[PDB]
């Protein structure tokens, strides 16, 4: 073992980085949707026959109990999605879907924007001001700061 200590000798940032080159994309850049039956595995429809019909219409499987607190303390994960038989493209970039009024304008999607519909970048807010932060992101009687 060799012990290493480092002291930064500038009064500002003395080093800076850049992302110079992109070699490849590891994910598939696909349109395969996230499997909410794997994320929330316990939920069933109250009427069992409706639940089984909904299971069959999608490709989803029967519900599963979560780990006990003891077992989740002794084990560090489950990973209920097994690997597929072949992987031609890279990693699955599972799309998460948020539901949208059909009348939301397309000019919003054309520039970078918060996909939830309101700005939330805290670099616009006074630091350590929690009431201003809550007001900025959730209060709907004052204007969104972006549009």
């Amino acid at each position: 073992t060799q012990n290493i200590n480092t002291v930064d000798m500038g009064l500002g940032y003395t080093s800076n980085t850049c992302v110079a080159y992109v070699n490849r994309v590891r994910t598939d850049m696909g349109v395969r949707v996230q499997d909410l039956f794997r994320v929330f595995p316990m939920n069933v429809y109250r009427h069992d026959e409706v639940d089984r019909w909904i299971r069959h219409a999608a490709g989803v499987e029967r519900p599963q109990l979560l780990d006990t607190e003891t077992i989740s303390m002794l084990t560090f994960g489950s990973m209920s999605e097994r690997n597929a038989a072949a992987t031609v493209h890279g990693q699955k970039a599972a799309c998460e879907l948020i539901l949208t009024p059909v009348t939301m304008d397309v000019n919003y999607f054309k520039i970078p924007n918060n996909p939830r519909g309101r700005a939330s970048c805290m670099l616009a807010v006074d630091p350590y001001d929690t009431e201003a932060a809550t007001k900025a992101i959730y209060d709907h009687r004052e204007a969104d700061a972006q549009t």
């Binding site: 607190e69 003891t70 303390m73 002794l74």
Partner: protein, 150 residues
Amino acid sequence: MEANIFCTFDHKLSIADVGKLTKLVAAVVPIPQRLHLIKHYQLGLHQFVDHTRGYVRLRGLLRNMTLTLMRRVEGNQILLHVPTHGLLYTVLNTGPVTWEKGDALCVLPPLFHGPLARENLLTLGQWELVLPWIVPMPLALEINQRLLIM
């Protein structure tokens, strides 16, 4: 096995931290997972302490944990050692319980002792070194019995 476990601290330890952490050498501290490298949040019972849920819950979590003896602390590393069956070790009782010779000792969550001060140790931020009580068998099965009878 993983005969030694490295516990790394994210908070920088003051002089007082290193001193009091040195005095605690040979104390019995539990780890949930039995891994070669752990972070200081996983050390101790503080991850689970929750007074709205009962004493039996914390008892159940503790009886399944892996127990270690503290060794020399260095810069941001604490070096926990797992004891092995049949060997001879020096152990520290931070608990207020008395030990007589020949006692058989059990691990249990701490109880309320009169003075109420209880000596909080290593309050790094809002983490804390909550050690269990190493209790001799008579008191251990007395508390288990009283709890069941309640």
